[PDB]
Subunit: 427 residues, 4 copies
Amino acid sequence: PYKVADIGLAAWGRKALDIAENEMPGLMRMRERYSASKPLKGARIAGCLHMTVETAVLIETLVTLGAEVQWSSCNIFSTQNHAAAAIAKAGIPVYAWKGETDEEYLWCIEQTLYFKDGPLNMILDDGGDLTNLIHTKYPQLLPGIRGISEETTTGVHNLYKMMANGILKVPAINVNDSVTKSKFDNLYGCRESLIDGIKRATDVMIAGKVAVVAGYGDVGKGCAQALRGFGARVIITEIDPINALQAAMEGYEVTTMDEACQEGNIFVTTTGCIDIILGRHFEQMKDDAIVCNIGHFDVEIDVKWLNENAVEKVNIKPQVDRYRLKNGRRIILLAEGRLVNLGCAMGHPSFVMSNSFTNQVMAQIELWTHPDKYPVGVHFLPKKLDEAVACAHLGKLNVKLTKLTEKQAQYLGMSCDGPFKPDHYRY
Amino acid sequence: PYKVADIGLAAWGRKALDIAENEMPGLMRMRERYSASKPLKGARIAGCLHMTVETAVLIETLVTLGAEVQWSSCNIFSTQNHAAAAIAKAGIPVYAWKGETDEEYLWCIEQTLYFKDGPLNMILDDGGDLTNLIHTKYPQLLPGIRGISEETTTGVHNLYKMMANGILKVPAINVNDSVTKSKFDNLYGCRESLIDGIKRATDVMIAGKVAVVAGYGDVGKGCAQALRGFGARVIITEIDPINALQAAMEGYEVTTMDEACQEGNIFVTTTGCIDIILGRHFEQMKDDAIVCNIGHFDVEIDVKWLNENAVEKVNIKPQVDRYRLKNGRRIILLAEGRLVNLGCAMGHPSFVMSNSFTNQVMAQIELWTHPDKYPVGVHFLPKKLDEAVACAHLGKLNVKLTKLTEKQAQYLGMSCDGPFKPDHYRY
Amino acid sequence: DKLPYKVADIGLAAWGRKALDIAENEMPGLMRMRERYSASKPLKGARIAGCLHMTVETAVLIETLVTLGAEVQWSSCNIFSTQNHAAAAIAKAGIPVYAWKGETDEEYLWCIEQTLYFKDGPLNMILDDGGDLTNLIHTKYPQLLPGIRGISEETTTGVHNLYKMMANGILKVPAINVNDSVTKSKFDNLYGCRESLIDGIKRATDVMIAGKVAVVAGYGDVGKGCAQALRGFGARVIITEIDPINALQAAMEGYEVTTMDEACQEGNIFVTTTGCIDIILGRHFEQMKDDAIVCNIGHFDVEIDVKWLNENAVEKVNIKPQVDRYRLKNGRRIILLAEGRLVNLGCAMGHPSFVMSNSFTNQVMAQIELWTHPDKYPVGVHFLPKKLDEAVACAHLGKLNVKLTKLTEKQAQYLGMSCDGPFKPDHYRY
Amino acid sequence: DKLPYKVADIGLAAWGRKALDIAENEMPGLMRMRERYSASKPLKGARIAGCLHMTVETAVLIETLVTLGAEVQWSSCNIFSTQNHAAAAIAKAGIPVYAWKGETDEEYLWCIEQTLYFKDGPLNMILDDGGDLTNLIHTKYPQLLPGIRGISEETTTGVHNLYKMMANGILKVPAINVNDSVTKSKFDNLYGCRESLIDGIKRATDVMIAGKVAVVAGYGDVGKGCAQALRGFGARVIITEIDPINALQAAMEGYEVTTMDEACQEGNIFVTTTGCIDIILGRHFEQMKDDAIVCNIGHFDVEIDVKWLNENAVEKVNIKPQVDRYRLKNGRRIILLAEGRLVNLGCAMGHPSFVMSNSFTNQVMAQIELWTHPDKYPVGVHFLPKKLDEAVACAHLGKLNVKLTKLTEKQAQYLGMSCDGPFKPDHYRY
Ligand SMILES: NC(=O)c1ccc[n+]([C@@H]2O[C@H](COP(=O)([O-])OP(=O)(O)OC[C@H]3O[C@@H](n4cnc5c(N)ncnc54)[C@H](O)[C@@H]3O)[C@@H](O)[C@H]2O)c1
Ligand SMILES: NC(=O)c1ccc[n+]([C@@H]2O[C@H](COP(=O)([O-])OP(=O)(O)OC[C@H]3O[C@@H](n4cnc5c(N)ncnc54)[C@H](O)[C@@H]3O)[C@@H](O)[C@H]2O)c1
Ligand SMILES: NC(=O)c1ccc[n+]([C@@H]2O[C@H](COP(=O)([O-])OP(=O)(O)OC[C@H]3O[C@@H](n4cnc5c(N)ncnc54)[C@H](O)[C@@H]3O)[C@@H](O)[C@H]2O)c1
Ligand SMILES: NC(=O)c1ccc[n+]([C@@H]2O[C@H](COP(=O)([O-])OP(=O)(O)OC[C@H]3O[C@@H](n4cnc5c(N)ncnc54)[C@H](O)[C@@H]3O)[C@@H](O)[C@H]2O)c1
Ligand SMILES: Nc1ncnc2c1ncn2[C@@H]1O[C@H](CO)[C@@H](O)[C@H]1O
Ligand SMILES: Nc1ncnc2c1ncn2[C@@H]1O[C@H](CO)[C@@H](O)[C@H]1O
Ligand SMILES: Nc1ncnc2c1ncn2[C@@H]1O[C@H](CO)[C@@H](O)[C@H]1O
Ligand SMILES: Nc1ncnc2c1ncn2[C@@H]1O[C@H](CO)[C@@H](O)[C@H]1O
């Protein structure tokens, strides 16, 4: 019926949820407005997202809207046991825990495919692991699936690659590229959870350190800003000249890893790309350099090299390894190269996840309630809905939004109700 | 042949240009690479942009590429006399000076329409004043015009309105919405020139003051950040819930002008919208509140109200008026509500304008060299060219850009040469 | 008879040692002290009773003192601040330590009393943090005062107490104000809190900082850091203050400065840093927004009226250790961290090890100074020489790869100054 | 005989007055002084010779001193710092002022000499900024020293000189160090420079700050502000320093700290703030990037080797007043601002009027203190009482709508402190 580390944590879990709800006004309005309507009636939503306190509230929201949900984790150390327990206690099949093996991980996603009253008809994925599993292993269920929504940047890039090669057989909504997700989650989320992750693992001082951030997209920007705020000297690496110039214009030295590896005290990878930190970098690092990743998959840091070339590996505590190298110096690796904010901390705070997840619900609704508008392709949520997500969070922050007058709306040639920006606007 | 305030300033002008060139690597590469090719051969580019030191370098670049240029200003107090003089000294008809009347302003744009060897075949406008003049007054020249490029946000919004109502008869390239413009010019440009404008006019202390910024788009963001940096408490107003939430997430109180007018020491309008600061606001302002605008046209502040309701208007010096109100308190107005960074300072520094203008040249080229790709419509510059502009500025900043390996480029499914981002990416 | 020590779990010793090994690499100031003095053992014959948070950083300090030849017995200066694996590591090393996380007020007093007597005589040196060890001896063990050579005090509240004792003529032992060493006050209090405050809030609540209104009471060194950290994460910070100079500083930095009576209606997060009583009261609690987070980082739990929450709330739910969620008659909730005790050490690991190396290098120097040069220090409250203050900073420049400029002989003569310092006059504020 | 004054253009008086009217609204500290003392005229019989930048802000100070019943004669303390319309406004008010923008070194000395003698006796009070007026009298007019009741000194370089004179036994008049009033040092030097440095660079060059590498030499109060301002606009700031404590501060704030020998190869902008000679030399100039901007904001033009640029450059082109562009043998160019003189006042209008109100309120208090309570001040260098220091800050809280908290009687007794202050011990560094 489910699978977790300890059901006895459900009580504590429920508390952490009650607290989360006040921090998630977005998702609460959805429950407020759709509870009686039950738009998601008939939908069996198979989920593969980090089983956390924040996700628990999302899972319960989908249920409040009248759906059946089965949940797996998308990372083997991201799950929060007490959050997984409260959900499991509510009669909702959840298969996830903290510290899964790859075989265990794959085995979890498999339990969420089949419900009591039939296979899954909805995917809510991030990274596309569930998406790619059903496309490769279970292509006989693809026709039964009505729609899918993708949370993260790497997962939508994959959804664009599949569609191009004509192997994407199910319609999909790019939830990452809702402004309210990409511009808040990736940025402000990592901005607050990065250092938290590093701190819990190492308790290292950030001030006075040189920190090297590989990549300056939305995630890199947040990471950079955070480290800067605590008095680190931040060095950026980048392949994109536009992003690189943005970093230079903010006062960041922009150079290569081949150079930066020699002066960094702290290393954070955010590229979504392979081969970012390699043996030739490690060998040049200062003693007890702290290396961690916050990209979606654990492919940015060459962990294999450390395991193969170090003289000794000492485990300090879970998700914290200290390698001694043949040069005598040591490398502190976090979460074995898996994303550090969920691996060594609690991931993003509930408020920002409310934004991401208020998007996710609108996407699950729009795929199940209006399947017409969305044919087999990679689609966006309309700006007006994107605006509605943001608007829904203004109350809690005591933001007082201005309303255009008739005269002003005419002068601008837009509606008082929105949308207020053209589609190409970048905020 | 031309019209300026003083040709005797040309010598000083030339110096300020020689200095500008080192700060404008973007535009220098264009001269380096196209001088011999003369792609703009045959093009008579009528220009309506702020006649400044930065613009002078742009004008000369278009000439270096083999074009005939006639230049007018787009604002009546933005022109820099010594810059206008150096251009006029180089045998290039320029009709612009600092302190023009509306009749003088219109009269300037009119001289740039007709060259020695025929009418204009290219527009390089901002705000769309030249665009709208030729469409309304001289529709007989529209067919002779090959293409147009628009610098600023208000001007492209107008170019979208014209196309919608089917009155835009000439193809146009949205240069504002090149990432390299919108994300650098509007943001980093105003970030540095706003306070400069305010300082030269008033020399007021920013620290300890409450500053009210109306609008939180790219311009508002820059203004807000700047004022914050000097220790002002910044209050934002906004109509867009997405922008408003962005401001809240940066630590800015977001409320209405109706409230903020009561506590602001400094007022900056950035909306591009009418009726932002009104009589009911002025009456509530603290004594010697400094009010200024940095949107493109002078329609955001109700200057007419001040002139009609104040008990006395005292001029402190050019572009600085001090009104005494019937309540006894005083309002310090800058530049009569026209944009303050060009009115009371020198506008944006050359480096950022190099970015904007390296875009402008590519747009002038693409309209004159490849007219096929661009039919009557509002078009964007391709990302690869957008990336090239940024790349061209990395050298001067000693930025060392990373190059993807073959293996990495394959994994990402993109080219080593770019483009590195999908079209919907927002940076 | 006498327990050799008392800690939560001796089994945590191995883990603690690892944390000690890592910490050492971040505390060059103390490691230089060991290297320089391990052979000479200046603190030989010293019997130092230490009352100060039993963290990993303090462990490194303890072993430094021992390396210098001292005998050391230790307790924590707060009931929630001990880090059990660090305690175990010390206990396992054969050093008498009496501390664990979650002490009763009575157990806390007991822990201090076990540090007072050594196998070969009473304590003859004091290393204190808040004055609790200092007051206990002056009040309950005055016959031990002539046998104590000196006192070094870590924190602001503590040195304030020292100065009051001196003015009223009741301080009987010479003391060094370590808090007001430049390399402590301007670094520990400021930069340490700037990182550890958020740490304690996050571990306890995992709340989004961005978009919140945060009220910081007091704008001294601790307040400055706290405020900076919160605004850094996108919170709008409001400041309360009684000192017009500190308040003007806050305003000049772009903070709204106002009273708690006003700010209690706005804040989503409250942080007290005053070292003063009665900062947040019932009348404030009753006006707060729902699930307002309330915590203190001043030395003593006296700034927040927790007893009011306990007597007047209609519900009280323990969320997890050092996190309680009250509900008031108005039906709105208050989250209280660490029962009003200082939240960085209560709900997290306190200051990072690097900045603590500054503070603790000052502590070691002070101990050496009082122990080996008593006649320099008559009964009173003294500062370390600026020369030594500068040496502390210098000892940490290497790790950060700072390259310090050296004055030419001409420049030094122009400034009327020694090349080797001191480089500032006594009244310099940095 | 004796000119009543000498200024650039008396016609600029009307404009200056407007600027004076505006400035007054931003200088509550001085305007409170007028209101409180205009009737009592504590400075009656005083004959104050002032040597300090003749800006709009100083004008407001001058008229404040007169309102208090003083006779005042004024000159500028720098040859490029005078604001001619402000000078005209004062001259027109019938106050003898000798100052204009662009003085020769010889004219500068002449200007000071005209302030020394009044219609009814020699000067009996000194208000100085850098010690130039102080040194001139001690060296060339020692027979005037017994007739001078006191000296108030504005800036760091000046008070350094005062302390040296006292140590060597050559200072003959009592003096108040105004620079090291908290409300001066921690505000003027820091917040003022944070705004006026960029001002001077911008007016002179209009250069993009964002993306540039900026080298700030020295990290004291001036350096802190300068550095902060540059990084705020998106420059990557590199710091040089001789003091290990100041250097550690810089590092802790995320700045690269290194030597000028290293940084001269990287910087696009250079800013000296040391108050020390020989900061930027020929060997540094020769390694700089093309069109590197070089300026100083320390009090004297001694930090940059301008004479080297003048003797060794192959080209020198004046771009505009106080902006010269050199070319070296290597064919790369150097832009020098204000001929090495302090660039905020040289190429702009100096500090904004609000923060100068702090400094100048301290100046007025010092003048009153020395003039009406001489016996409090024997020959030496003294500080203002913290009570008065606090009063300065308090006088400026109203304009910023700061709401200061008042201690309850219980809180005050707990802190062992007066409700009306002073709220900090003497050694507090804020
Ligand atoms: N840990 C989390 O909670 C979390 C949250 C959001 C996103 N993510 C993940 O973070 C990664 C990026 O997210 P983003 O939204 O920042 O994507 P993004 O595309 O905005 O940023 C990626 C940046 O990496 C740069 N880059 C790529 N290869 C590089 C290389 N070899 N060297 C240097 N720079 C390189 C690109 O130029 C790009 O700017 C993705 O894997 C996404 O799934 C994680
Ligand atoms: N002065 C300069 O040098 C300079 C440079 C670039 C752009 N601009 C001008 O600045 C203006 C905006 O530029 P942008 O790129 O910032 O455009 P933008 O659309 O990003 O920002 C405009 C913001 O104004 C807000 N807004 C509109 N009406 C409002 C109202 N009544 N109250 C509050 N907020 C309101 C919108 O929500 C939007 O976010 C345009 O007029 C543009 O031409 C000037
Ligand atoms: N938890 C830690 O790790 C840590 C670290 C350093 C210091 N401390 C403690 O923190 C407290 C403050 O340290 P500090 O060095 O910042 O002291 P400080 O004296 O520099 O600043 C304290 C501020 O509180 C202000 N204040 C006093 N009463 C007030 C009131 N009723 N309302 C508002 N403001 C008020 C004072 O004016 C002063 O500015 C002390 O108790 C010290 O021991 C704790
Ligand atoms: N232009 C203005 O408006 C203005 C305002 C205030 C002060 N000042 C002047 O600015 C100068 C500094 O003022 P401050 O109060 O910042 O003095 P300060 O003594 O606080 O800091 C000066 C710094 O320079 C450092 N230093 C000395 N020699 C050095 C060297 N060779 N290399 C690197 N660093 C070195 C010192 O260590 C010190 O930290 C003084 O001359 C003062 O009069 C000017
Ligand atoms: N606490 C959280 N719960 C669920 N998903 C999260 C959390 N924090 C970050 N994420 C998501 O994890 C993904 C990274 O793989 C991103 O899409 C990001 O939004
Ligand atoms: N110095 C300058 N020269 C020319 N155009 C400028 C300058 N500074 C800002 N602008 C442009 O002015 C427009 C505002 O009307 C924007 O498009 C902006 O890029
Ligand atoms: N990690 C830590 N270990 C020991 N003492 C600490 C730590 N962090 C902060 N402190 C001390 O706590 C005191 C507050 O009571 C401060 O004086 C500070 O030196
Ligand atoms: N606008 C100004 N008017 C007068 N003096 C000023 C101004 N700005 C800075 N100063 C003074 O210049 C001195 C530096 O020589 C500082 O002590 C400072 O007080």
